[PDB]
Design a binder for this molecule. Structure first.
Ligand code: 0GJ
Length: 265
């Protein structure tokens, strides 16, 4: 029953963006770290629940080499920092950062998190917690297809604050011809990357829907065969919501092999 969700209508707001209930994105996860000693818990990234005890994310979310006990993963929370009514918190048993992750070019920006629970069933499905469907390796959706993204990250590139509530963004798959350095300010684009951005330009709002800092590891889901299918993991981008500049994402179909292995099967 992956890819299902009781979609509720997002509240639009000031920036022209959207705020939404966790029910519309049950696969979304919030990862926190605790560098030890004491003194707070910092928001690290977002994550995607692919199965009851596994979570996908961006390799670059792990700058400071953390230890499993430090990392905490909460699911089923709408507000980044308030405790959710049906939230579910777990702890990392072990996390895997893609061996060939290039900090310089964000290539292979992908990492797994094995949860830890006293039962072979960690996350318990509910209207607020539910896995996303992994695409088959043959899945290549048509250019310009409409997808979605979610996260609790920043709203504008230059903002010291992360979002206080779950964001919902609407973007479209850019064609390959438009996903090159020439468009991404001469920045490097690889075969493991995929561009997606909001094409609704001009309108009142200066910024278009897009993921920003703090969203990394979050999903880029597109409906396929009546089920939300995971298509990319929020990796990088030059700025945030700049009109006509697509966001770069990790091409999940390139990593089904890597996942299948590092994930116990
Ligand atoms: C780590 C992760 O949360 C962020 C997500 C930003 C997503 N951006 C877009 N447009 N969807 N990932 C990174 O920050 C990876 N590094 C970068 O994106 C740098 N290019 C940041 C430079 C800048 O802020 O302009």
């Amino acid at each position: 029953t992956c890819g299902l969700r009781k979609y509720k209508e997002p509240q639009l707001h000031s920036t022209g963006g959207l705020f939404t209930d966790i029910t519309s994105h049950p696969w979304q996860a919030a990862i926190f770290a605790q560098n030890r000693r004491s003194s707070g818990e910092r928001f690290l990234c977002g994550g995607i629940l692919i199965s009851s005890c596994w979570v996908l994310t961006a390799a670059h979310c792990f700058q400071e080499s953390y230890l499993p006990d430090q990392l905490k993963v909460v699911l089923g929370r709408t507000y980044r920092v308030k405790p959710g009514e049906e939230e579910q918190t777990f702890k990392v048993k072990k996390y895997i950062v893609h061996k060939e992750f290039d900090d310089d070019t964000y290539n292979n920006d992908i990492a797994l998190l094995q949860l830890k629970s006293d039962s072979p069933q960690c996350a318990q499905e509910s209207d607020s917690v539910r896995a996303i469907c992994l695409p088959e390796a043959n899945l290549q959706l048509p250019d310009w297809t409409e997808c979605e993204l979610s996260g609790y990250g920043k709203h504008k590139s230059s903002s010291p604050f992360y979002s206080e509530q779950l964001k919902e963004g609407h973007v479209r798959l850019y064609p390959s011809s438009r996903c090159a350095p020439k468009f991404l300010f001469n920045k490097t684009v690889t075969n493991n990357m995929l561009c997606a951005g909001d094409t609704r330009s001009g309108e009142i709002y200066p910024n278009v829907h897009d993921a920003c800092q703090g969203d990394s590891g979050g999903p880029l889901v597109c409906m396929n065969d009546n089920h939300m299918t995971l298509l990319g993991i929020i990796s990088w981008g030059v700025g945030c919501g700049e009109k006509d500049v697509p966001g770069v994402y990790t091409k999940v179909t390139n990593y089904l092999g890597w996942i299948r292995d590092n994930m116990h099967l």
